[PDB]
Amino acid sequence: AKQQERTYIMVKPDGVQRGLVSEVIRRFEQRGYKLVALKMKSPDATLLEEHYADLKGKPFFPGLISYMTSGPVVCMVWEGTDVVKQGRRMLGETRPLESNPGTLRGDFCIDVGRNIVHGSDSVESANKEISLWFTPEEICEWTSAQHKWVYEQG
Amino acid sequence: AKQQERTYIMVKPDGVQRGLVSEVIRRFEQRGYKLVALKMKSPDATLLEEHYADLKGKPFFPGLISYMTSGPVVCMVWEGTDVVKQGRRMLGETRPLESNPGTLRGDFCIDVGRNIVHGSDSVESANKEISLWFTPEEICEWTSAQHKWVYEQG
Amino acid sequence: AKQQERTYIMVKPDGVQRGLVSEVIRRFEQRGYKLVALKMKSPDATLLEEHYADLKGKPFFPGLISYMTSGPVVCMVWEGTDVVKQGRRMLGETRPLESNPGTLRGDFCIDVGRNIVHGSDSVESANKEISLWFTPEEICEWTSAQHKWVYEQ
Amino acid sequence: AKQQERTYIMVKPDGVQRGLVSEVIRRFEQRGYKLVALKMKSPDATLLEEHYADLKGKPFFPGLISYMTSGPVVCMVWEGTDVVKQGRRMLGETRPLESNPGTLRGDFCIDVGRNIVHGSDSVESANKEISLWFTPEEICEWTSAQHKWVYEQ
Amino acid sequence: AKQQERTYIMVKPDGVQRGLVSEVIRRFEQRGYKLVALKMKSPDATLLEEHYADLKGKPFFPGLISYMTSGPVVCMVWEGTDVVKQGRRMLGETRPLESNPGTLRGDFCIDVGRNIVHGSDSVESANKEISLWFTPEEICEWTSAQHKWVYEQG
Amino acid sequence: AKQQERTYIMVKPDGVQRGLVSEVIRRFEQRGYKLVALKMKSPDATLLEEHYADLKGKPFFPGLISYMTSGPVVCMVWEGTDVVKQGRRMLGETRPLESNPGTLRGDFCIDVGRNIVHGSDSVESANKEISLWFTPEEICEWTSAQHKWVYEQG
């Protein structure tokens, strides 16, 4: 079902350090998207290496892993129709320098290696990333009071 | 004259229900556009049938009318140069999933059937829409104190 | 009974002029109060003179009436528990210079004669102000979707 | 020793339902308090019955537990000087009708039974709430880059 | 003349460093107070020592001076009725731990030594501080288009 | 170096009059760009004519000069990677009617002549403008505590 589509959003160490946690949550919360999982974590290197498994072997991999463990991150799971595509459109382009005002990276970032937040690039990655960072017990399913005002009835 | 242009903006039932009336108003108010008519109303079906007259005969028509009578609406008239087109642009695309961050629909909506606000799509239709939801007596003309700083006549 | 309580809130001409209509509405709308009536209006002198009846004859009365008709106002009826008192508290003190930061007048005003907004001072005067500024047909009754989350039963 | 003080802040089910999670976090985040633990949870009746242990036997107790399990909550631990007392001051008074504008409850709540958020009332009370809601492994130790500018020195 | 009362407001080094410049300005700009002088500066010890002349005898004074030269400050002169006392009110109490929510210090500070901003305590201090930090040529006198809406003409 | 890049940003008289000074500063400040020079000034014709030299000879030139001496301006220098380009993008298109929501002009403006703000269009003109409006003694050198979180290690 469309409305049960989920995406993994993660505030990176720079996002936490710069006090942007609330702001990242705000963009999703005000949109009518539903937060079904959340936690602050000081991830281990091994958990991040699997997350960035696609980048293993590249010259910047070590630097990326150490940087991503230089501070704690905030893991989130958002649910709602097309939340994967809308999610990353709300974050902006990968590069803050190509991101427009109104987006998170366009509003708050400059360097690509300090882009404060991560969003799953597809439904496939989202389902994978959700299972990597969270256990099914951490997913809190609920119904919004505003559901019928956010979504069109069948 | 350019500056006398007017458009009809209406916060739909979902916008009122989700506590978005002030935000819709903020977008136009901070832009320098001038509010000249405003009211909350729970319109009759007869009035809504005339508003969506061109949609009469469609299979979703009866349901639309029931949805637009399921909660009150806030009716508005804003005046200023190119307000019709700028208003639409500020609302976003008709579909929230194609609307950009920074727009009302891009920031707060997901489903097209719950896109929170309506804006006249053209000057011709604006004049029609205004004459329909408001009497001439409800229009309140005034001159903004910021007029010479928002507009440049020499 | 308690939730049914209503108050009359009005953005004065200086409030409309200074672009503060959305900020006044927000204070109430984000608090969980329910907007049941709303309209922009250019009230005539007679209406305003009835509203400020007790002040007729004061040296500043004519000037007061001129000011209240120098631009449009935004009329509102908000509904909810203790909305009269909480409304007044949100607007701040009548004198902006005695209003705390966080209140509308504390955040946006200086002169008492330019205090952007009015709120009924009691349930009795709210009932009076509401029937003066609005007709019963302009009051739209509905049920907020967040009602069970704003109020305990 | 003073800067290590911690408090437990919890967004209740009405807070999440009304979209106020980010706003609660903001008040603490912008103040300079360090977020050291955070999670969304759907606690079971046993955990809540322990949290509200003093209220057992009250006629409203069963209803209170069902309400507190009617939707998920967001649990938090903030760290910083005098954070327990300031945290309470930022939330407002337990009763929203006694909370001033600028505080969380004063800005967003009306009923004491739907007062959107909870804060530990004392150091000793926080330490107990923290260990009850969080394992020590969920507490993340870190140094803020703005430390020398928030604290002296 | 009460409307022409001026006060000296300065964003301290922690304020600049924590990105709170726009927020301190917003509090006054928003209130209807008029910005008549503004500048970023890295004052030398002699100027600061004179600015804090009353605290000259205290044991912490030298440490206060070196802290005030550890980063730049944003100097401001605001104008309006009772601006000195209201300015102070808006900043909060000297001590952030005694400042209420809604005030600058109550919203953003914790330590009294990192209370992000300074405001003149009286008209006499204001006048002394203005002429110390600014020259009359830097004081830009102007009339606000909103004057007749912020103030009663009487 | 990329990060050392600077651009001149100026709040025009309409921006000051409309109380948008804090908003213009916020866009850059929250982005992570660094404020290194700031001042309110009532520039004389000679300076304004030098700033707008490219437009000398145009029929509207005198009127432009009159308008720019109509009220005070706020002069700023912002430092950071690609700040000239990103600054312009954050301001919006020259014409407010062609500016997107989320940009300064798209959010607050209507007329091209009342577009509240100016930003240098290139590095070359940025260097010229900064020297014109500010002396080197007015530029404040400092290091931001969020630097390692705004910019990549190296």
Author numbering:
A (entry chain D), B (entry chain E), E (entry chain B), F (entry chain F): 3 to 156
C (entry chain C), D (entry chain A): 3 to 155
Show the paper's wording:
Toxoplasma gondii is one of the most significant parasites that impacts human health, with estimates that as many as one third to one half of the human population are infected. At the Center for Structural Genomics of Infectious Diseases (CSGID), the first Toxoplasma Structural Genomics Pipeline was established. The genes encoding these enzymes were cloned, proteins expressed and purified, crystallized, and crystal structures were determined.
Nucleotide diphosphate kinase catalyzes the movement of phosphate from a nucleoside triphosphate to a nucleoside diphosphate (e.g., GTP + ADP –> GDP + ATP). In both structures, TgNDK forms a hexamer with an average BSA of ~18,900 Å2. Comparison of TgNDK with known crystal structures of homologs proteins suggests that the TgNDK hexamer is likely a biologically functional assembly. Crystal structure of TgNDK suggests that the protein forms a hexamer with conserved nucleotide binding sites. Pairwise structural alignment revealed that active site of TgNDK may undergo similar conformational changes as its closest homolog, humanNM23-H2 transcription factor. These observations suggest opportunities for the selective design of TgNDK inhibitors using structure-based molecular modeling techniques.
